Amino acid sequence: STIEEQAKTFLDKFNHEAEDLFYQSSLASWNYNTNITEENVQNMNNAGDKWSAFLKEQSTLAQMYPLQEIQNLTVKLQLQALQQNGSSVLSEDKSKRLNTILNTMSTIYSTGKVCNPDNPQECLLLEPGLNEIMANSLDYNERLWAWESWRSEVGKQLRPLYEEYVVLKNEMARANHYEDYGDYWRGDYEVNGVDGYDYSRGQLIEDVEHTFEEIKPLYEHLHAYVRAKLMNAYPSYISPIGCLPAHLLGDMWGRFWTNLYSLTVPFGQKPNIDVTDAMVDQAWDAQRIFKEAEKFFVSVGLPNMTQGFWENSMLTDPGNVQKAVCHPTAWDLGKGDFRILMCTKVTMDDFLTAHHEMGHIQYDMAYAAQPFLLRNGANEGFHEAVGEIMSLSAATPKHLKSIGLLSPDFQEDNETEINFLLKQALTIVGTLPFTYMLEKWRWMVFKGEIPKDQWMKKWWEMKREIVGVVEPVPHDETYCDPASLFHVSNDYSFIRYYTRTLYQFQFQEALCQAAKHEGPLHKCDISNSTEAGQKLFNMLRLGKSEPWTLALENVVGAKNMNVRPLLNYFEPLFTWLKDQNKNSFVGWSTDWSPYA
Amino acid sequence: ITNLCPFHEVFNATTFASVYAWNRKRISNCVADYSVIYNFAPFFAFKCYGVSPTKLNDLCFTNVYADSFVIRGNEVSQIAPGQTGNIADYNYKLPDDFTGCVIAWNSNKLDSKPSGNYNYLYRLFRKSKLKPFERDISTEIYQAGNKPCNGVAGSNCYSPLQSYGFRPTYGVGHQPYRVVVLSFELLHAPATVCG
Ligand SMILES: *[C@@H]1O[C@H](CO)[C@@H](O[C@@H]2O[C@H](CO)[C@@H](O[C@@H]3O[C@H](CO[C@H]4O[C@H](CO)[C@@H](O)[C@H](O)[C@@H]4O)[C@@H](O)[C@H](O[C@H]4O[C@H](CO)[C@@H](O)[C@H](O)[C@@H]4O)[C@@H]3O)[C@H](O)[C@H]2NC(C)=O)[C@H](O)[C@H]1NC(C)=O
Ligand SMILES: *[C@@H]1O[C@H](CO)[C@@H](O[C@@H]2O[C@H](CO)[C@@H](O[C@@H]3O[C@H](CO)[C@@H](O)[C@H](O)[C@@H]3O)[C@H](O)[C@H]2NC(C)=O)[C@H](O)[C@H]1NC(C)=O
Ligand SMILES: *[C@@H]1O[C@H](CO)[C@@H](O[C@@H]2O[C@H](CO)[C@@H](O)[C@H](O)[C@H]2NC(C)=O)[C@H](O)[C@H]1NC(C)=O
Ligand SMILES: *[C@@H]1O[C@H](CO)[C@@H](O[C@@H]2O[C@H](CO)[C@@H](O)[C@H](O)[C@H]2NC(C)=O)[C@H](O)[C@H]1NC(C)=O
Ligand SMILES: *[C@@H]1O[C@H](CO)[C@@H](O)[C@H](O)[C@H]1NC(C)=O
Ligand SMILES: *[C@@H]1O[C@H](CO)[C@@H](O)[C@H](O)[C@H]1NC(C)=O
Ligand SMILES: *[C@@H]1O[C@H](CO)[C@@H](O)[C@H](O)[C@H]1NC(C)=O
């Protein structure tokens, strides 16, 4: 008959085959992750090989149907997804070289170990001891040694591999119709074929720059306050108008500033909000915590878990000979099977992580009716924002009192609120300039504007410029500092966090306004409202069928990202920071270099 | 009362075949007692259309037909008059004036293995719709393109029959369900089946 029906039949067959193959692969992966054995490794390898092959032949067969004959605007989307995610255009030698480079990079990053200073006796790994040293150790010399040694020993090996990798990726992208790998990455947000909702791959850069230009002042005030506190901590090294030394950010790379809370607490004498002792006294356990999270999810009107989830999901550390990865994950094996993997302890951090993962589980359940190629979020930020809004809402003193863990006699005021806001800021605000810089540098290097001989010079120049952090030790072009990051080494996009940061606050403001909330935004609870839950579910059930711009309009009445919700959220801290920055000059100096 | 109409064969059979080839059993010349049906596990959907369930023993008909097959959990709502959807319009079509009851209960423990089940097939493509109370077993390449398939598979040439898959870990709505359909009718002949 017509091309549309001929493609519909093919999609109908592929939808049924892919579900079975994906279920088998996911079951094998879950079995290995809960049971680390060589036989499970082999099973995962076989399942993954079969799935990848099947995707390859399906994508190859899908090339027969031209796109210009389709007007459903849904079959076109499914066919485009299949083609994009299954097509390969590289020669066999180039593909083998690229795969070998990726495997070597992953192995080097995983097995990279640094040894104790000026000693071949002992060598340490990143996660066990280096992270703890960077988080807690206050020794200037020790932190500097760890930073320098780790960065050198990881980057000097991976620099030429990164050069060959960027060459191969640029070749592949130019073989495709995209201009370069940066355009290939930015093509995720593109929306075409709809009037009044179209999006262009080049508009993302302009929007990100505009948002950063609007967000700068809060970051600069926070930087001034943190500089003052770090001067109070370490007297001699820090300069009044210069950038902060890189090795004193409380972590390996400076992604998060959470570890500086002990040094930068505004009002230490006030008690901190902790319920670990209360949970210990009330004899809570993982099942009780998960039941509490499920009850909170039910209270807004969303459906709750099935029996299979409780029967199959593991929520405790096995121990003994059974060893499993304890990084919390939300698993969607498909075909109505949803599981959660997490090693749980009796802490408020795990209590919040329960809600955070349950949000992802609910989002996965929401779009179960959509086709296989559309069972996914609108883009790479919606899933994370949905996961994070529930964790944002579950930390309120009102919710803590309603559950009963928090004492009813607790009172809130100036200093509790300011401490909570600063603790949230040190985690949320700090990472945004770093993410923007990393994405901008990767886009520039993929475009080819920055030559290899000037990669490091430009890197440290914008380090002095934007984030206001200066290197402690000079480095030549031999090093590869960006490759020291896990995401950079393992080829993952990085703008999803920047998008999620704005999306979560827009969603939170929309839900709080829907729930007829009054007062400061940071004290908001949506547990008992049934209209915010209805709106959220209405957005969740769509899936990938509708454009993300249309979904965002349906939620918040806007077609683009905005920072005004974030500014409104952080205004009470902004006023206090303005008050406290009276005698400190705001702004860093790029000319300052700590190494004379 | 000697010749009890035996229903524990149409039920309790350990084999219900596939939906695309459903068995048909004619019950006649016996005394029918419907109380034996309620002796099994709780039924997922007990729906009677043309007769009150309490008065099944107070009225009787010329003949009774029993059909049995196995389908998925979430296609049960489609076995009903006036419903539209793949299974109903391609494997088992009911008439508008259907008089009887529809029986369906879960059999996950009995019709599932960890390795996978591929002995329960169903039809996916067909040239035209199905008339009420019709059966098709023909297995030919469903041609979708202009170029004739010539009896081979490949581009725009697909097999019509596609099999299910049943594992014990599947969620509700994908687990196998066993369905039994009872039909009552009239014609110019003595009824002779009741008691
Ligand atoms: C088309 O083909 C592409 C492959 O090119 C597939 O793309 C992948 O899609 C999946 C699904 O989104 C991506 O999976 C995501 O990976 C992230 C990477 O995390 C790494 O690091 C953590 C440790 O920090 C490890 O634990 C992890 O195993 C990874 O090694 C995850 O962080 C993501 O998890 C997020 O969501 C869960 C909830 O589900 C949260 O609990 C997490 O905390 C986190 O927020 C996620 O799992 C994958 O990265 C993509 N590949 C690439 C190369 O980008 C498509 O799936 C495919 N499309 C099809 C088949 O339709
Ligand atoms: C693009 O193609 C899709 C796929 O066919 C079209 O979606 C189809 O829309 C029709 C009418 O809305 C749906 O029919 C309905 O079927 C259900 C049973 O599934 C029945 O109960 C209803 O009474 C109704 O008849 C059909 O299911 C649906 N198909 C799918 C796969 O969802 C869509 O309409 C097309 N778009 C355009 C613009 O033509
Ligand atoms: C964890 O993995 C081990 C090894 O893969 C499992 O032991 C296997 O168990 C199956 C069935 O129980 C046997 O058929 C294999 O012969 C066993 N292999 C070995 C090497 O003993 C073990 O059962 C797994 N644990 C859990 C809880 O599933
Ligand atoms: C949502 O409703 C529930 C029940 O109507 C509220 O739970 C009560 O909360 C008060 C504190 O305000 C406690 O003293 C009661 O013991 C709770 N009862 C039960 C049965 O849990 C809950 O507080 C409401 N949510 C909000 C945000 O007010
Ligand atoms: C949530 O689960 C409980 C059992 O734990 C159940 O009684 C309740 O009906 C569920 N919620 C909804 C909305 O069905
Ligand atoms: C603390 O609250 C009191 C309430 O009267 C107010 O006068 C004071 O200015 C507040 N201090 C800060 C730092 O907000
Ligand atoms: C059928 O019934 C017999 C006896 O009534 C019993 O032994 C057998 O297990 C039953 N089988 C099924 C599948 O119900």
Residue numbers in the entry:
A (entry chain A): 19 to 614
B (entry chain B): 332 to 526
What did the article's authors report about this structure?
To observe the interaction between RBD and ACE2 with better resolution, local refinement was performed on RBD-ACE2 and reconstructed at a resolution of 3.29 Å. Similar to the RBD-ACE2 complex structures reported for BA.5 or BQ.1.1 bearing F486V2,5, the F486S substitution changed the side chain to a less bulky hydrophilic residue and lost hydrophobic interactions with the hydrophobic patch consisting of F28, L79, M82, and Y83 in ACE2. We have reported that F486V contributes to neutralizing antibody evasion by sacrificing affinity for ACE2 in the BA.5 study, and a similar result was observed in the F486S substitution in this study. While the side chain of ACE2 K31 interacted with the backbone oxygen of BQ.1.1 S RBD F4902, it was located approximately 4.4 Å away from that of XBB. S RBD F490S, resulting in interaction with the side chain of XBB. S RBD Q493, which also interacts with ACE2 H34 in an alternative conformation. Similar to the other SARS-CoV-2 variants, the residues L368I, R346T, and V445P were not directly involved in the interaction with ACE2. Although R346T does not directly interact with ACE2, R346T lost interactions with N450 and Y451 forming a loop, together with Y449 interacting with ACE2, in XBB.1, compared to those of BA.2.75. On the other hand, in the XBB. RBD-ACE2 complex structure, ACE2 showed an open form but the N103-linked glycan of ACE2 was found to intrude around the active site of ACE2, which was structurally considered to be an inhibitory factor for its active form.
